[PDB]
Symmetry: D2
Subunit: 116 residues, 4 copies
C-alpha cells in the first residue's frame, strides 16, 4: 500500500470519518489527471488507493475534501479543501502516508515517507 | 487591507522571509485567474495584495512557494508548494489573514477573519 | 518587549480573546516562581509582560488557560491548560514570541525569535 | 492499552523514534506523582504504559521529552518538552492516544479519545 491518507478531527478528538479524498497526477501536458479516490474509514484511514505498479514517479496532488466533511456535520468551515502536492518515487519506490488534522478554520498536514 | 498572508518557519523559529506568494481568483470557467502576488517581508508578512474594491466574493487560492524557500536555505523539502483555498463571503468579517507555519515535511495553516 | 504571547482560535478563525496567561521562571530549587501574567487582547496578543532588565536567562513556563477559554464559549475541551516551556538564551535573538493555535482537542505552538 | 503516545518528525518526514515520555498523575496533595514512562518505537508509537486497572480517573500529564530527542540528533531545539495535561476517565474508562508532530521550534499535539 504505497499511498495512504490518515485524518484526525481536532474538535471531536476522534478520527475524521468519511472524508473524501481525490488524488491527481500531473500529466505530460501539465494538467491534473484523476489518479485515484476514496474515503476515510471509521479509523480515519484510507487504504487501497493505488498499487506499487500504478504509483509511478510523478507530481501528485492529494485533495482532502474538508469542506464536504464539515458541511456533512452541519458546520460551515473556512477552506474549500486541503491540497497536498508532492513529487513521489523520484529516488525509487517509497511508501507515503499523508496525515492531516482538521479544525473548521485550520488544518495541519505532514508526510511520513518510508523505504520498504 | 482585506487580505494578508503571514508565514512562519518552525525549523529556525523565525518569520519565513522572501517567500513568493501568488493569489488567484476562480473564474467563471473554473480556471485560476492571477489576482495578486508578492514576497513576504522581514516579518514574514505580505501586505497590500488588494483593495476593498478589487476583493469581491468568490473562491481564492493562495499559493506559497515553500519548495524555493527551503532550497534557498539548503534544505530538501517534501511539498511542491502550499496551497490555501477558501471562499471570501461578505457576511463574515471583512479582513482575512492567511497564516502558515512551515516545516520541511509539514505545514499548518489557519485563517484569522476579523471586523 | 522581550516576551510576547499570541493566541489564535482554529474553530472560529479569530484571535483568542481574554485568555488568561501565566508566566513562571524556574527557581534554583526547581519550583516555578510567578513572573508575569495577563489576558490576551482583542487581537489575541499579550504585550508588556516584562522588561529587558527583568527577563534574564533561564527556563520559563507560559501557561495558557485554554480550558476556561473553551468553557466560556460553551465548548467542552480536552486539556486542563496549554504549557510552553523553553530556555531564554542571550546568544540567540533577543525578542521571543510564543504563538499558540487552539482547538478543543488539540493545540499547536511555535516560537518566533528575532533581533 | 488505554494510554498510547504517537510522535512524528516534521523535518525528516518519519516517525519520531526513541522519544522518551514520562506520565504523571496529580496526587491527593496536588503534586505530580510519577505514573509511567517509556519511549517511542521504530513506528513512533509507545504502547504498554499502563493497564485498564491502574489507569484510574485523575489529571494526567504526558511529558514528551522533545529537547532530549532533538539533542540526540545533534539539533539545538527551542522547547524543554511538550506537556499534555488532561482529565482522564471522568465519564468512565476511555482509550487515549496523545499524538504529537515535532519541529525544532514548534510542536502540534492532538488527542484521540475512544470508548471501547
Ligand atoms: C495515528 C496516525 C496514523 O494512523 O497514521 C496519525 C494520524 C494523524 C496525525 C497527526 C497528528 C498531529 Cl499532532 C498533526 C498532524 Cl498534521 C497529524 C498523527 F500524528 C498520526
Ligand atoms: C501574527 C504572526 C506573529 O505574530 O508572529 C503569527 C502568529 C501565529 C501564527 C501561527 C500560525 C499557525 Cl498556522 C500555527 C501557529 Cl502554532 C502559529 C502565524 F502564522 C503568524
Amino acid at each position: 500500500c504505497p499511498l495512504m491518507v490518515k485524518v484526525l478531527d481536532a474538535v471531536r478528538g476522534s478520527p475524521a470519518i468519511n472524508v473524501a479524498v481525490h488524488v491527481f497526477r500531473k500529466a505530460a501536458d501539465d494538467t491534473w489527471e484523476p489518479f485515484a479516490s476514496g474515503k476515510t474509514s471509521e479509523s480515519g484511514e484510507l487504504h487501497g488507493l493505488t498499487t506499487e505498479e500504478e504509483f509511478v514517479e510523478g507530481i501528485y496532488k492529494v485533495e482532502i475534501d474538508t469542506k464536504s466533511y464539515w458541511k456533512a456535520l452541519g458546520i460551515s468551515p473556512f477552506h474549500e479543501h486541503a491540497e497536498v502536492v508532492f513529487t513521489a518515487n523520484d529516488s525509487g519506490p517509497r511508501r507515503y502516508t499523508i496525515a492531516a488534522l482538521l479544525s473548521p478554520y485550520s488544518y495541519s498536514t505532514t508526510a511520513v515517507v518510508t523505504n520498504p
